Amino acid sequence: DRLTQLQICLDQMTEQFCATLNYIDKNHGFERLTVVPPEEFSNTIDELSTDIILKTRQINKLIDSLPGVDVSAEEQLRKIDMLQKKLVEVEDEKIEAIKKKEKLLRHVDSLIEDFVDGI
């Protein structure tokens, strides 16, 4: 949900990189080297160009934050292996604990049962 939020974020650019080429194409923007005044065009072209520069920045800061970059496939493949193991260990610890607590509970309950008046 990052490499895809990147991928996702990179579609917008593709979309604005066409949402632009469209203007440039559909407004004789090629002929810049009913018609839209030479001002509106520029205000528009800048309004998009600038917007695209900000996307380029974002897409990097994201590629930097993108996880796994530095790490190897091996440095990971074991890290998973470990976590798998250290995880079993922790559940056996959980189990045990649970048992010990329920024993404790059984103890308390027994006590409480013997304080009751009525057969």
């Binding site: 949900d1 990052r2 490499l3 895809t4 990147l6 991928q7 990179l10 650019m13 593709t14 990189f17 632009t20 080429l21 440039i24 090629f30 810049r32 080297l33 072209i45 160009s49 695209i52 520069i53 380029t56 897409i59 990097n60 590629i63 993108l66 996880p67 796994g68 970059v69 530095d70 790490v71 190897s72 496939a73 091996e74 990971q76 493949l77 890290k79 998973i80 976590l83 798998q84 250290k86 995880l87 922790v90 559940e91 610890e93 959980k94 604990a97 649970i98 607590k101 404790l104």
Partner: protein, 98 residues
């Protein structure tokens, strides 16, 4: 053979600048003769493509970081579950001594 990703990110970072320059020219911020204009457009399409193939080839390595992120998460949960059981036993000690 390791499918080096430290590399794939290099490229990705390159294509990106390359894509930005090439766009900077199409727009007119940078200078370029009109018999190139369309080649710029050529380059942008091709650029955006390669980029896609990269991010595309980056999912495996992505997936792993996700697993390693889940395991981490649940391992922290269980640990907590125990430390929560522990507390109760300590509060029962307090409650017992008043």
């Amino acid at each position: 053979e390791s499918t080096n990703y430290q590399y794939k990110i290099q490229e990705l970072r390159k294509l990106l600048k390359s894509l930005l320059l090439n766009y900077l020219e199409l727009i007119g911020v940078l200078s370029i003769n009109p018999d190139m204009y369309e080649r710029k457009v050529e380059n942008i399409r091709t650029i955006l493509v390669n980029i896609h193939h990269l991010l595309n080839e980056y999912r495996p390595h992505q997936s792993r970081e996700s697993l390693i992120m889940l395991l981490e998460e649940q391992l922290e949960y269980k640990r907590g579950e125990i430390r929560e059981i522990e507390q109760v036993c300590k509060q029962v000690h307090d409650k017992l001594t008043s």
